[PDB]
Amino acid sequence: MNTINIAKNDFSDIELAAIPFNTLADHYGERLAREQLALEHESYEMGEARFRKMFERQLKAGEVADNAAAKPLITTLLPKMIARINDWFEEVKAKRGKRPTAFQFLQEIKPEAVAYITIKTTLACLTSADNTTVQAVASAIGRAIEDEARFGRIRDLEAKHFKKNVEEQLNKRVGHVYKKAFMQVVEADMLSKGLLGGEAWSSWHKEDSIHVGVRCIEMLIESTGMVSLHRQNAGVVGQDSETIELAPEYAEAIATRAGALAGISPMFQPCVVPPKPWTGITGGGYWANGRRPLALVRTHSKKALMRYEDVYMPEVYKAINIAQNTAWKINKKVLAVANVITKWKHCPVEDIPAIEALTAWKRAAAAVYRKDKARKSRRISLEFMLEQANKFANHKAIWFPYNMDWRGRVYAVSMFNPQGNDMTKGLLTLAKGKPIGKEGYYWLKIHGANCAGVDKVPFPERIKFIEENHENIMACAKSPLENTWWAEQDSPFCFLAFCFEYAGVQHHGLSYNCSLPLAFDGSCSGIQHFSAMLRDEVGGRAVNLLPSETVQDIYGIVAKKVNEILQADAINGTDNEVVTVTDENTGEISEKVKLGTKALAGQWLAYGVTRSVTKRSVMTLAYGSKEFGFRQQVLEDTIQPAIDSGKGLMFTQPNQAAGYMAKLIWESVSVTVVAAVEAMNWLKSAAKLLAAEVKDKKTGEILRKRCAVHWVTPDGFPVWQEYKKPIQTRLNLMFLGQDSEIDAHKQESGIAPNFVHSQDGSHLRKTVVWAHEKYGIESFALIHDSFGTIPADAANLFKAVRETMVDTYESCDVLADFYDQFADQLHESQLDKMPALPAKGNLNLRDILESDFAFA
DNA sequence: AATCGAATCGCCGC
RNA sequence: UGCGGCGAU
DNA sequence: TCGATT
Ligand SMILES: O=P(O)(O)OP(=O)(O)OP(=O)(O)OC[C@H]1O[C@@H](n2cnc3c(-c4cccs4)ccnc32)[C@H](O)[C@@H]1O
Ligand SMILES: [Mg+2]
């Protein structure tokens, strides 16, 4: 209940410690040392305040058991509670005579749930309610017990399949009362169908709700010493009451843990000196010896991190330190614009003045509810980014530490960082610029065209777009508030940043010093990498790996292929037929028309199929999506928005149209990018064979335990895949739910997306070192697929990102290297089942050097 | 037989 | 952890 | 749709 302040004797260490001060004062001076270490002192200070504010509000709301400081307390006490409730059940059954009142109520709820609801509600009542009476907390236990018994029978009983239809809207409800009002209208709806056996709940009375709680409190006192019984004015019939007090030893446990956790989570701020170079696993980035040291790899387990101690990966270490050394500064010009517009609009860009009815009304209401929370969540992120940009505005330069995820993608550590949204990217620019020159001016206009959404057109048409709109750009630069043209663009704040740089070149000529980050973003890198490994000519051209006519739109190509089979099916497709299907719950066979492919093609041609229908399906292919996943997508992306808007009259049966759409998209994407589909199948089959435990059926004994998946990337960064699952988990309807084996399903669902994400991270890192050593590039803007630098270095980074990818896949067969990692661990019975390596195609990688639109 | 499930990271909230 | 929402890729 | 889990 009362937590020590860490800052008084412990946060003072990081400012006074001589070794962190000296090692950083040696590099950059004593005065910057006191500023940087005070900034990190503030970083832990605001983080401590975040934990205390959350804990105080959780204490008031009764959600203290949901806080992480109470969690290890719950883990130890609660096995004792389930055994004590299970032992008392057998005691009463052995005893003759009438049962206690609480006995019949207790059996309706699962034994481990009885354990939970008592502890949390006793914690909730002892930390917030100000009433320590036994009677008041027993009724709170029993009322929450009657909740899980009455509405948990929907989840447990013959509605479990139907509960899978009501669970997500229950999860979308925020607050226990809102989750309650939804469960009441659900329960009445199901009773109208006889789904609960027609048995309506008889509400427990107030005397019954106390008896379940009283038996539950004293059963916690028998099992655990958490909670202690006291009597006041005993022997007086008018004033005899019993109170309940939380045990002091358990109070100090959560208080020490809450204090320990508060010093462990700091709010990461940018660095006013260049960040600490990484020499090992830990201690990089920020300079102080803090309570939470930065890890080079963000891992879930410490053991997965300590696997990185011995690996010699010098090129990985060099690339992270080069990215850290990139000097950034706040764009003051766009900050002046952003500081005034956000006062007037909740979102600066959202609203600019410019020239089944039962179910559809619920869906419209759910959109307004989702839009309302989306608005408040979007705004609070904006106010933090603006206050960070205002805080570091006056500094001549700021820096961002970098580390990596377990796949090797590199991320900035500060909460305000250049891998953020458009406004945050707009507020940030590089600090060390050079005179722009003719070539830099060319790429500055190309970057300006990309910010406007003119990325689908060749480079000369991008230049002509800028020069045609020359007067609009200078009008926006001179007065951004008077001309809202820049805000109507695809990347508005980043476009406004281009406008200021474009105006300065017009004012100061080609000698103008420009430090804007000019971003080159790969089109679809997962397919781009996959087509490079297996030499896919057709797939590579679709993702602009080949020098092409125009920019190749893979979404348009798939939509074009879809429209080919659509027109073929409208002529020679199947006719409609009548099929019989039954709901399992209703148990009644009904006859409905199954539309043939000729009718479904006519529906889709009437709607008009463009790249928008095929867009989301192509992106999710690298994440493992297939035909079934596309059906949900095209229903919610295209069919349902059409239906609500007055269109969708062609989609008489929307699920049959969506499934037909999903089949056509999958047939189109599989023949467009064949190496992508083939490679993710081969990786999935590999993780399949390793993640199985191989037992002979007769002996029932393992011949090969469950095996993780490990590969090393061309950079030299090792990566293991170690998806593990807990054995037991427990979930309540109105209350929050709270070694181990390998999750075989997660190993396959993740192997292909993580392998290709590990491939782009190496390519990003190898690009960074190649651009820094072969060319003179010192400033890098990196977002996974995006490569940014100053305009004077833009042409060289254009070459370096191509040169690294050609040099990588000409030197390494990463799939063959992947095979040599796991071939020894394969069981002998699994060897015949393994698919062979996919066949290499006729693609020449040297054409990537001549490809304009790969960008990567 | 019956059933189940169709990428990573960060912030905020419960 | 889980769930809700936001953002990045 | 589609094979793997349970
Ligand atoms: O609209 P078009 O311009 O015509 O076509 P696209 O340029 O291809 O798409 P767009 O919407 O404009 O945003 C593209 C820009 O944001 C990045 N980006 C946006 N969304 C994603 C996603 C997914 C979102 C939902 C499921 S997965 C996954 C990886 N990267 C993404 C892109 O990496 C690019 O940088
Ligand atoms: Mg776009």
Coordinates of C-alpha atoms in Angstrom, one line a residue, chain A residues 295-711:
Chain A
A295 CA 20.0 -5.1 -24.5
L296 CA 21.4 -5.5 -28.0
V297 CA 18.6 -7.9 -28.8
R298 CA 15.1 -7.5 -27.3
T299 CA 14.4 -11.1 -26.1
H300 CA 11.6 -12.5 -24.0
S301 CA 14.0 -14.8 -22.1
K302 CA 17.4 -14.0 -20.6
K303 CA 18.7 -17.3 -21.9
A304 CA 17.9 -16.3 -25.5
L305 CA 19.9 -13.1 -24.8
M306 CA 22.9 -14.8 -23.3
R307 CA 23.1 -16.9 -26.5
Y308 CA 24.4 -13.7 -28.1
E309 CA 27.4 -13.3 -25.7
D310 CA 29.8 -15.6 -27.6
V311 CA 28.8 -14.9 -31.2
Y312 CA 31.4 -13.0 -33.2
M313 CA 29.3 -10.6 -35.5
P314 CA 31.5 -7.6 -36.1
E315 CA 29.5 -6.3 -39.1
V316 CA 26.3 -6.4 -37.0
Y317 CA 28.0 -4.3 -34.3
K318 CA 29.4 -1.8 -36.8
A319 CA 26.0 -1.1 -38.5
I320 CA 24.1 -0.4 -35.2
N321 CA 26.8 2.0 -34.1
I322 CA 26.8 3.8 -37.4
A323 CA 23.0 4.3 -37.2
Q324 CA 23.4 5.5 -33.6
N325 CA 26.0 8.1 -34.8
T326 CA 23.5 9.7 -37.1
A327 CA 22.9 13.3 -35.8
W328 CA 19.3 14.5 -35.9
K329 CA 17.7 17.8 -35.1
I330 CA 14.2 19.1 -34.7
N331 CA 12.7 20.8 -37.8
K332 CA 11.8 24.1 -36.3
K333 CA 9.8 25.3 -39.4
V334 CA 7.3 22.4 -39.3
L335 CA 7.2 22.6 -35.4
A336 CA 6.0 26.2 -35.7
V337 CA 3.2 25.0 -38.0
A338 CA 2.4 21.9 -35.8
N339 CA 2.3 23.9 -32.6
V340 CA -0.6 26.1 -33.8
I341 CA -2.6 23.6 -35.8
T342 CA -2.9 21.0 -33.1
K343 CA -4.5 23.7 -30.8
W344 CA -7.3 24.1 -33.3
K345 CA -8.0 20.5 -34.6
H346 CA -7.8 17.2 -32.7
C347 CA -6.0 15.8 -35.7
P348 CA -4.2 18.4 -37.9
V349 CA -5.0 16.6 -41.2
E350 CA -8.2 14.7 -40.7
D351 CA -10.9 17.3 -41.6
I352 CA -10.0 20.0 -44.1
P353 CA -12.7 21.8 -46.1
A354 CA -12.2 20.9 -49.7
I355 CA -14.2 21.1 -52.9
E356 CA -30.1 -6.9 -41.8
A357 CA -31.0 -3.3 -40.8
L358 CA -31.0 -4.6 -37.3
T359 CA -27.4 -5.9 -37.7
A360 CA -26.1 -3.0 -39.9
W361 CA -27.2 -0.5 -37.3
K362 CA -25.3 -2.4 -34.6
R363 CA -22.3 -2.4 -37.0
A364 CA -22.6 1.4 -37.4
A365 CA -22.8 1.9 -33.7
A366 CA -19.7 -0.3 -33.2
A367 CA -17.8 1.9 -35.7
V368 CA -18.7 5.1 -33.8
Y369 CA -17.7 3.5 -30.5
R370 CA -14.4 2.4 -32.1
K371 CA -13.9 5.8 -33.7
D372 CA -14.4 7.5 -30.4
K373 CA -11.6 5.5 -28.6
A374 CA -9.5 5.8 -31.7
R375 CA -9.7 9.6 -31.5
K376 CA -8.6 9.9 -27.9
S377 CA -5.8 7.3 -28.4
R378 CA -4.5 9.1 -31.5
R379 CA -4.5 12.4 -29.8
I380 CA -2.6 11.4 -26.6
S381 CA 0.3 10.1 -28.8
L382 CA 0.3 13.4 -30.6
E383 CA 0.6 15.5 -27.5
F384 CA 3.6 13.5 -26.3
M385 CA 5.4 13.7 -29.6
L386 CA 4.8 17.5 -29.7
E387 CA 6.1 18.0 -26.2
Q388 CA 9.2 15.9 -26.9
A389 CA 9.9 17.9 -30.2
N390 CA 9.4 21.1 -28.3
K391 CA 11.7 19.9 -25.5
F392 CA 14.6 19.1 -27.9
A393 CA 13.9 21.9 -30.4
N394 CA 16.6 24.3 -29.2
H395 CA 19.3 21.6 -29.2
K396 CA 21.9 21.8 -32.0
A397 CA 21.8 18.0 -32.4
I398 CA 20.1 15.0 -30.8
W399 CA 20.8 11.3 -31.1
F400 CA 18.8 8.0 -30.9
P401 CA 20.2 4.7 -29.5
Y402 CA 19.4 1.6 -31.5
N403 CA 19.0 -2.1 -30.8
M404 CA 17.4 -5.1 -32.5
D405 CA 14.5 -7.5 -32.1
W406 CA 15.1 -11.3 -32.1
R407 CA 14.9 -11.4 -35.9
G408 CA 17.5 -8.6 -36.3
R409 CA 15.4 -5.7 -37.4
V410 CA 16.8 -2.5 -35.9
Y411 CA 14.7 -0.1 -33.9
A412 CA 15.3 3.2 -32.1
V413 CA 15.0 3.0 -28.3
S414 CA 13.6 6.5 -27.5
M415 CA 9.8 6.8 -27.3
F416 CA 10.1 9.9 -29.6
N417 CA 12.1 8.6 -32.5
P418 CA 12.3 8.9 -36.4
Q419 CA 10.5 5.5 -37.0
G420 CA 7.2 7.1 -35.9
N421 CA 4.2 8.4 -37.7
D422 CA 4.1 11.2 -40.4
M423 CA 4.1 14.1 -37.9
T424 CA 7.0 12.7 -35.9
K425 CA 8.9 12.0 -39.1
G426 CA 8.1 15.5 -40.2
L427 CA 9.3 17.0 -36.9
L428 CA 12.7 15.2 -37.4
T429 CA 15.5 16.0 -39.8
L430 CA 19.2 15.3 -40.0
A431 CA 21.6 17.7 -38.4
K432 CA 24.7 17.5 -40.6
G433 CA 23.8 18.6 -44.1
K434 CA 25.9 19.4 -47.2
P435 CA 25.3 21.7 -50.2
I436 CA 22.6 20.1 -52.2
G437 CA 24.0 20.2 -55.8
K438 CA 22.2 19.2 -59.0
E439 CA 21.8 15.6 -58.1
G440 CA 20.5 16.3 -54.6
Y441 CA 18.0 18.8 -55.9
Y442 CA 16.8 16.0 -58.3
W443 CA 16.2 13.5 -55.5
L444 CA 14.7 16.2 -53.3
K445 CA 11.9 16.6 -55.8
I446 CA 11.6 12.8 -56.1
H447 CA 11.2 12.6 -52.3
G448 CA 8.7 15.5 -52.5
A449 CA 6.7 13.6 -55.2
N450 CA 6.7 10.5 -53.0
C451 CA 5.3 12.4 -50.1
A452 CA 2.4 13.5 -52.3
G453 CA 1.5 10.0 -53.3
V454 CA 3.0 10.1 -56.8
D455 CA 5.2 7.0 -56.2
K456 CA 3.4 4.9 -58.8
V457 CA 4.7 6.9 -61.8
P458 CA 8.3 6.9 -63.3
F459 CA 10.9 9.4 -62.2
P460 CA 10.5 12.0 -65.0
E461 CA 6.8 12.2 -64.3
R462 CA 7.6 12.7 -60.6
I463 CA 9.9 15.6 -61.5
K464 CA 7.2 17.1 -63.8
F465 CA 4.6 16.8 -61.0
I466 CA 6.9 19.0 -58.8
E467 CA 7.6 21.6 -61.4
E468 CA 4.0 21.8 -62.5
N469 CA 3.0 22.4 -58.8
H470 CA 5.9 24.8 -58.2
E471 CA 3.7 27.8 -57.3
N472 CA 1.7 25.7 -54.9
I473 CA 4.8 24.5 -53.1
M474 CA 6.3 28.0 -52.6
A475 CA 2.9 29.3 -51.4
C476 CA 2.8 26.6 -48.8
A477 CA 6.4 27.3 -47.8
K478 CA 5.9 31.0 -47.4
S479 CA 2.7 30.7 -45.3
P480 CA 1.7 27.1 -44.4
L481 CA -1.4 28.3 -42.5
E482 CA -2.7 30.3 -45.4
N483 CA -2.5 27.5 -47.9
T484 CA -3.8 24.1 -46.8
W485 CA -2.6 22.4 -50.0
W486 CA 0.3 20.6 -48.2
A487 CA -2.1 19.1 -45.6
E488 CA -4.2 17.4 -48.3
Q489 CA -1.2 15.3 -49.4
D490 CA -0.5 11.6 -48.6
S491 CA 2.4 12.4 -46.1
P492 CA 1.5 16.0 -45.2
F493 CA 4.0 17.0 -42.6
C494 CA 6.8 15.3 -44.5
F495 CA 5.6 17.0 -47.6
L496 CA 5.6 20.4 -45.8
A497 CA 9.2 19.6 -44.8
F498 CA 10.0 19.2 -48.4
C499 CA 8.3 22.5 -49.3
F500 CA 10.6 24.4 -46.9
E501 CA 13.7 22.7 -48.4
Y502 CA 12.4 23.3 -51.9
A503 CA 11.9 27.0 -51.2
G504 CA 15.4 27.4 -49.8
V505 CA 16.9 26.0 -53.0
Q506 CA 14.8 28.5 -55.0
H507 CA 16.1 31.3 -52.7
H508 CA 19.7 30.3 -52.3
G509 CA 20.5 28.2 -55.4
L510 CA 22.2 24.9 -55.6
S511 CA 24.8 25.8 -52.9
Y512 CA 22.0 25.6 -50.3
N513 CA 22.8 23.3 -47.4
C514 CA 20.1 20.7 -47.1
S515 CA 19.8 18.1 -44.4
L516 CA 16.4 16.6 -45.2
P517 CA 16.2 12.8 -45.0
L518 CA 15.3 11.5 -48.5
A519 CA 13.7 8.1 -48.0
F520 CA 13.9 5.2 -50.5
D521 CA 11.3 2.6 -49.6
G522 CA 11.3 -0.9 -51.1
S523 CA 8.0 -1.8 -52.7
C524 CA 7.3 -5.2 -51.1
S525 CA 10.5 -6.4 -49.5
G526 CA 9.4 -9.8 -48.3
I527 CA 8.5 -10.8 -51.8
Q528 CA 11.6 -8.9 -53.0
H529 CA 13.9 -10.9 -50.8
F530 CA 12.0 -14.2 -51.6
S531 CA 12.3 -13.7 -55.3
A532 CA 16.0 -12.9 -55.0
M533 CA 16.7 -16.2 -53.1
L534 CA 15.0 -18.4 -55.7
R535 CA 15.7 -16.2 -58.8
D536 CA 12.1 -15.5 -59.7
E537 CA 12.0 -13.4 -62.9
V538 CA 8.2 -12.9 -63.0
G539 CA 7.9 -12.3 -59.2
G540 CA 10.9 -10.0 -59.2
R541 CA 9.5 -7.8 -62.0
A542 CA 6.2 -7.5 -60.1
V543 CA 8.0 -6.1 -57.1
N544 CA 10.2 -3.8 -59.3
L545 CA 13.4 -5.9 -58.8
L546 CA 13.8 -5.7 -62.6
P547 CA 14.3 -2.5 -64.6
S548 CA 10.8 -2.0 -65.8
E549 CA 8.6 0.2 -68.0
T550 CA 6.8 2.0 -65.2
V551 CA 6.5 1.3 -61.5
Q552 CA 5.0 -2.2 -61.3
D553 CA 1.9 -2.4 -59.0
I554 CA 1.7 -5.9 -57.7
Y555 CA -1.8 -5.1 -56.5
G556 CA -2.8 -4.0 -60.0
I557 CA -1.2 -7.1 -61.5
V558 CA -3.2 -9.5 -59.3
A559 CA -6.4 -7.4 -59.9
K560 CA -5.7 -7.7 -63.7
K561 CA -5.2 -11.4 -63.4
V562 CA -8.4 -11.6 -61.3
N563 CA -10.3 -9.7 -63.9
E564 CA -9.1 -12.2 -66.5
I565 CA -10.6 -15.2 -64.7
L566 CA -13.6 -13.0 -63.8
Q567 CA -14.4 -12.4 -67.5
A568 CA -13.7 -16.1 -68.3
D569 CA -16.1 -17.3 -65.5
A570 CA -18.8 -14.9 -66.6
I571 CA -18.9 -16.8 -69.9
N572 CA -18.1 -20.4 -69.0
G573 CA -18.7 -20.6 -65.3
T574 CA -20.8 -22.9 -63.2
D575 CA -24.6 -22.4 -62.9
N576 CA -26.4 -21.9 -59.6
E577 CA -27.4 -25.0 -57.6
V578 CA -29.5 -25.7 -54.5
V579 CA -27.7 -27.2 -51.5
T580 CA -28.9 -28.5 -48.1
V581 CA -27.1 -27.3 -45.0
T582 CA -28.0 -27.3 -41.3
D583 CA -27.1 -25.2 -38.3
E584 CA -25.8 -27.6 -35.7
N585 CA -27.6 -25.7 -32.9
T586 CA -31.0 -25.5 -34.6
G587 CA -30.6 -29.0 -36.0
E588 CA -32.9 -28.3 -39.0
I589 CA -31.9 -29.0 -42.6
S590 CA -32.6 -25.9 -44.8
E591 CA -32.3 -25.4 -48.5
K592 CA -30.3 -22.4 -49.8
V593 CA -29.0 -21.5 -53.3
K594 CA -25.3 -22.0 -53.8
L595 CA -24.3 -19.5 -56.5
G596 CA -22.2 -20.8 -59.4
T597 CA -19.1 -19.1 -60.6
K598 CA -20.9 -17.5 -63.5
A599 CA -23.3 -15.7 -61.2
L600 CA -20.5 -14.7 -58.8
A601 CA -18.4 -13.3 -61.6
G602 CA -21.3 -11.2 -62.7
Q603 CA -21.6 -9.8 -59.1
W604 CA -17.9 -8.8 -59.0
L605 CA -17.8 -7.3 -62.5
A606 CA -20.8 -5.2 -61.6
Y607 CA -19.0 -3.9 -58.5
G608 CA -15.7 -3.3 -60.3
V609 CA -12.5 -5.0 -59.1
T610 CA -9.5 -2.7 -58.8
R611 CA -6.2 -2.9 -56.9
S612 CA -8.1 -2.0 -53.7
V613 CA -9.8 -5.4 -53.6
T614 CA -6.5 -7.2 -53.9
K615 CA -4.3 -4.8 -51.9
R616 CA -4.4 -6.1 -48.3
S617 CA -4.2 -9.8 -49.5
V618 CA -0.9 -9.2 -51.2
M619 CA 0.7 -7.5 -48.2
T620 CA -0.3 -10.2 -45.8
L621 CA 1.1 -13.0 -48.0
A622 CA 4.6 -12.4 -46.4
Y623 CA 2.9 -12.9 -43.0
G624 CA 1.5 -16.3 -44.0
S625 CA -2.0 -15.4 -45.3
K626 CA -3.6 -17.8 -47.7
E627 CA -7.0 -18.3 -49.3
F628 CA -9.0 -18.6 -46.1
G629 CA -7.5 -15.4 -44.7
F630 CA -8.3 -13.5 -47.8
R631 CA -12.0 -14.4 -47.4
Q632 CA -12.2 -12.5 -44.1
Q633 CA -10.2 -9.6 -45.6
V634 CA -12.2 -8.9 -48.8
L635 CA -15.4 -9.2 -46.7
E636 CA -14.4 -6.5 -44.3
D637 CA -12.3 -4.4 -46.7
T638 CA -14.6 -4.4 -49.7
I639 CA -18.0 -6.1 -49.4
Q640 CA -19.2 -4.9 -46.1
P641 CA -18.1 -1.2 -46.7
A642 CA -19.9 -1.4 -50.1
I643 CA -23.1 -2.8 -48.5
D644 CA -23.3 0.0 -45.8
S645 CA -22.6 2.7 -48.4
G646 CA -25.6 1.8 -50.6
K647 CA -23.6 -0.4 -53.0
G648 CA -23.2 -4.2 -52.5
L649 CA -26.6 -4.9 -54.0
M650 CA -24.8 -7.3 -56.3
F651 CA -23.5 -9.3 -53.2
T652 CA -26.8 -11.1 -52.5
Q653 CA -24.8 -13.7 -50.5
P654 CA -21.7 -11.9 -49.2
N655 CA -19.8 -14.9 -47.8
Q656 CA -20.1 -16.8 -51.1
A657 CA -18.8 -13.7 -52.9
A658 CA -15.9 -13.4 -50.4
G659 CA -14.9 -17.0 -50.7
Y660 CA -15.0 -16.8 -54.5
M661 CA -12.9 -13.6 -54.3
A662 CA -10.4 -15.3 -52.0
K663 CA -10.0 -18.3 -54.4
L664 CA -9.4 -16.0 -57.3
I665 CA -6.8 -13.8 -55.4
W666 CA -4.9 -16.9 -54.2
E667 CA -4.8 -18.4 -57.7
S668 CA -3.6 -15.0 -59.0
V669 CA -0.9 -14.4 -56.4
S670 CA 0.5 -17.9 -56.5
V671 CA 1.2 -17.8 -60.2
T672 CA 2.4 -14.2 -60.0
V673 CA 5.0 -14.6 -57.3
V674 CA 5.9 -18.3 -57.4
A675 CA 9.1 -18.2 -55.4
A676 CA 7.5 -16.5 -52.5
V677 CA 4.8 -19.2 -52.1
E678 CA 7.3 -22.0 -52.7
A679 CA 9.8 -20.7 -50.1
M680 CA 7.3 -20.2 -47.3
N681 CA 6.1 -23.7 -47.9
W682 CA 9.6 -25.1 -47.6
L683 CA 10.4 -23.1 -44.4
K684 CA 7.0 -24.2 -42.9
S685 CA 7.7 -27.8 -43.6
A686 CA 11.2 -27.4 -42.0
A687 CA 9.7 -26.0 -38.8
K688 CA 7.0 -28.7 -39.0
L689 CA 9.6 -31.5 -38.8
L690 CA 11.7 -29.9 -36.1
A691 CA 8.8 -29.0 -33.8
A692 CA 7.4 -32.5 -33.7
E693 CA 8.3 -34.9 -30.9
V694 CA 9.1 -38.2 -32.7
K695 CA 7.8 -41.3 -30.8
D696 CA 7.5 -44.9 -32.0
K697 CA 3.9 -45.7 -31.5
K698 CA 4.5 -49.1 -29.7
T699 CA 7.0 -47.8 -27.2
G700 CA 5.3 -44.4 -26.7
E701 CA 8.8 -43.1 -26.0
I702 CA 10.5 -40.1 -27.7
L703 CA 13.1 -40.7 -30.3
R704 CA 13.6 -36.9 -30.9
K705 CA 12.5 -34.2 -28.6
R706 CA 10.8 -31.0 -29.8
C707 CA 13.5 -28.9 -31.5
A708 CA 13.8 -25.2 -32.0
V709 CA 14.6 -23.5 -35.4
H710 CA 17.9 -21.6 -35.8
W711 CA 19.6 -19.8 -38.7

